[PDB]
Ligand SMILES: *O=P([O])([O])O[C][C]1O[C](N2[C]=NC3=C2N=[C]N=C3[N])[C]([O])[C]1[O]
Ligand SMILES: *O=P([O])([O])O[C][C]1O[C](N2[C]=NC3=C2N=[C]N=C3[N])[C]([O])[C]1[O]
Ligand SMILES: [Zn+2]
């Protein structure tokens with residue numbers, strides 16, 4: 001599973017991507033997992049302050065994943 | 081062969097892409113071919129007024145191609 | 161619309177673009193665009209909507225110019241600190257293009273007021289900085305079917321979406337439902353604001369293809385651009 | 401560099417960005433950037449280099465402001481028609497940020513002159529409209545190892561590359577060797593010019609990753625962005 005991290009997510013967790021194993025069902029399962037790795041991780045992937053796309057399409061924290069699934073975590077932005 | 085066309089090339093030839101067959105050796109062989117299809121084509125893919133990338137990397141009109149090769153034709157731009 | 165001779169000269173570089181022509185220029189001249197937020201995004205976008213010849217701009221913001229804004233809101237200046245952003249912007253905008261009509265509205269509007277106001281324009285640019293007003297704008301735009309060109313920027317991240325509110329197209333809540341001071345680098349606003357201006361012009365003139373059904377995300381830190389497709393959420397409160 | 405109190409306030413939104421901070425702001429304040437071409441790209445880029453706090457800008461252009469420029473060169477105005485673009489730009493730029501030093505050079509320089517001038521800056525923005533000067537700039541930048549932030553725009557197509565001139569990195573001729581009035585949509589210049597400002601700031605402050613080794617191509621017609629990798633050409637006349 002290509003999970004990619006963009007913008008502030010990337011900057012916070014220090015990696016643009018981590019080829020992981022396909023052991024995750026969904027997106028809200030992944031997020032949880034990855035958030036537990038560290039406070040840096042938790043802040044970066046903090047629920048509410050995050051957006052997720054599965055395979056180039058944006059999804060809710062319930063879409064599911066599979067080997068060959070690219071998952072991208074990145075911040076929403078409401079400033080301007 | 082995904083040959084993609086961008087910006088003015090696309091606008092001139094009326095297609096963003098044409099899945100073609102892998103019957104082309106290179107890039108300057110393709111260009112020639114495709115240019116001969118019509119004046120619209122010739123102008124769009126006019127040598128000198130064109131840039132080519134093979135597989136997301138920019139190449140001279142001599143790089144070669146193969147099935148699974150994506151080729152992108154698009155204009156250089158020197159205005160500003 | 162008809163263009164004067166002086167206008168045709170001013171707008172020559174657009175007029176000679178292929179599928180744009182006089183008609184496209186005329187279309188801009190006849191448009192009424194509502195720009196909500198004359199902060200960073202608004203300044204960046206309005207400047208080109210103005211220069212480009214969009215004939216009628218309504219500028220809506222409740223806030224005044226502060227010194228901190230001057231790092232990125234380039235229509236404003238030290239001399240306009242304390243003035244309502246819509247006024248400082250209008251003055252700058254009228255100098256960028258004295259052929260256009262500019263209507264500043266220094267207020268914080270309610271939904272009833274936005275409904276009227278949104279309906280009175282051809283297109284709305286959302287250049288605000290908070291999801292409450294963004295949702296309000298989306299609600300009014302959806303209701304009236306007035307396209308919304310939505311831009312956002314913070315830090316080193318920008319995003320743009322065009323909502324045209326067609327059948328089957330997601331709305332902004334489709335997006336905002338997916339989520340619940342910070343700095344902002346100056347040029348970021350330029351990129352996203354100019355993209356807003358571009359998509360706006362494209363919509364107003366029916367030129368090219370709008371960035372609807374996707375979020376265009378610009379990661380300035382790495383200079384990358386990702387386009388994630390946006391799907392309609394079945395139970396979107398607004399468009400569901 | 402040290403920032404005054406008024407500067408720290410003005411630049412607060414950049415100063416509070418994570419790896420930017422006072423040091424990054426100070427870095428901008430201490431930079432000397434040469435912007436070549438105060439046309440569309442130059443106006444769009446300089447405005448944010450200025451607002452952002454790049455302390456010293458040298459503006460180089462030989463041309464005067466014309467009415468047609470006003471469709472997109474928003475620093476200029478009807479009142480400055482006939483003036484040297486560098487002067488109209490300087491006047492506008494000083495109002496965007498009165499803390500910066502701006503040096504207008506209304507001339508068409510030769511290679512000997514560009515060599516001196518390029519060497520005297522930390523970074524050059526190429527905002528010109530012809531490959532001759534672009535190659536000249538690339539030549540001088542390569543020689544002196546002064547990073548070049550190269551932008552181009554015509555029609556509905558824009559492009560950006562950063563040349564940092566490291567070992568193994570392609571130069572601009574690596575690109576221009578691959579090839580041998582037209583309109584231009586106003587906001588296009590905004591997008592690319594702002595991207596130039598962004599990459600420039602990033603380089604000057606060592607912030608994030610520059611767009612070197614690639615052409616970032618923006619297709620405004622479809623709002624798509626493609627990044628094609630640029631490789632060094634073995635026999636590039638300049639860097640070969
Ligand atoms: O992001 P910036 O802070 O640079 O600009 C946002 C701009 O939007 C304004 N704004 C927020 N909410 C608004 C509004 N304007 C008009 N109505 C509402 N509800 C804010 O004052 C800014 O200048
Ligand atoms: O693309 P625009 O026409 O909007 O702007 C380009 C700008 O570049 C200037 N230019 C071209 N060649 C130059 C130069 N400036 C300085 N030296 C040289 N050799 C042109 O006058 C424009 O304003
Ligand atoms: Zn919806």
Ligand SMILES: [Zn+2]
Pocket residue numbers: 570571572573574575632633636637638639640
């Ligand atoms: Zn080279």
